[PDB]
Amino acid sequence: GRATNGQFVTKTAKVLRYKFVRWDALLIIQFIDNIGVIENPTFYRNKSIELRSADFLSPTLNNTYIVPLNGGVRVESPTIPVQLEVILENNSSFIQVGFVRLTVKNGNPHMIIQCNPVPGNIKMIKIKSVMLFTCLIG
Amino acid sequence: GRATNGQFVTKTAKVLRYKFVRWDALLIIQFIDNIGVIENPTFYRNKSIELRSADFLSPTLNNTYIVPLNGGVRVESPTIPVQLEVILENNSSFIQVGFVRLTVKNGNPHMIIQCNPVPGNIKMIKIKSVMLFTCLIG
Amino acid sequence: GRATNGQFVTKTAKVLRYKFVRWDALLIIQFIDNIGVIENPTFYRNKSIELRSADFLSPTLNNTYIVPLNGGVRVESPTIPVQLEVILENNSSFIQVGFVRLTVKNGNPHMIIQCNPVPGNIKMIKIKSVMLFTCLIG
Incomplete structure (x- = not known):
């Protein structure tokens, strides 16, 4: 039980708020932004x-x-698929099914986002899905 | 523990049966039709x-x-992706990766279904996936 | 609590290792290969x-x-979407969003994998996602 607030922080000091439950074995984490x-x-x-x-x-x-990422939890999550919008530097954009995992490199959390080829360089990805990872610890 | 039967009902009195578990914090709900x-x-x-x-x-x-929707539970779920088939009025059809959430407006549950542009108006969406939402309460 | 090792085995004696948690009602199973x-x-x-x-x-x-499949658990899972690569006999390949379920026929577990039309016959599917099923028992 009850759902504890957490966050990560990005290189550019963006703050990705989430809620979680640890039940352990079990970690279930939802992004809430x-x-x-x-x-x-x-x-x-x-x-x-x-x-x-x-x-x-x-x-x-x-x-x-x-x-x-900095702060929050170190989990190897499963892959979840999401609605993405990829914004090129030329400001065209593509809707895609993206795939996201959390993973741990060195001592640190990372988000992995995987999408399809775009005909240009990327200024922004927007994740438009509500993301929840159910994770197994150990 | 054990899995309690539930249902929603649509405008046209269609009944969407599900099973759930509330563990709270945690609500896990599966459509079983x-x-x-x-x-x-x-x-x-x-x-x-x-x-x-x-x-x-x-x-x-x-x-x-x-x-x-009427009845069942009021949750803000995550987005899940599903296999859809969209049936146009002209009866052509498109397979798509759709994205579904449960959400709560006013006092009421709603299902959100999001798909890709189709070249016509829609008579029917069919969800062909087995759908399960893991939800966090509060 | 804690996460118990398991496996299936395929016709060709491939071994698909997983971890799980049974909490029952609830079975949560992750492939770990x-x-x-x-x-x-x-x-x-x-x-x-x-x-x-x-x-x-x-x-x-x-x-x-x-x-x-042989061994492991008999569950009717939900559908999960995954990153696939489908390898034709002519060795061209297609990235796809696939959809996977576990299901039980006769006394036996089966994995269902569903993808898009390919212009040839298939030598291999590779699942490139990390797969986790949250299942409801009964």
């Missing part, structure tokens, strides 16, 4: 987690973006 | 949850279909 | 679970591959 809402009987708003070029390790292979 | 089966060593049958135009709020922006 | 790693600040390696033509039931309808 971008919970979509219905405004109007014609309109649902997706909110985004906005990650910029500066939050990624340069350089990138295989459209795999590594977002090194 | 469409559990696929192997009939024959050559054949697996996906079953569908069939949602019609009449179950959605008209009008729809961004290929986002809001299915207002 | 292919946990990706960061080697270098430019490189994350996806690992694959490699399933071959011989692990599937011939013949296949609807790009649905049935992998009959």
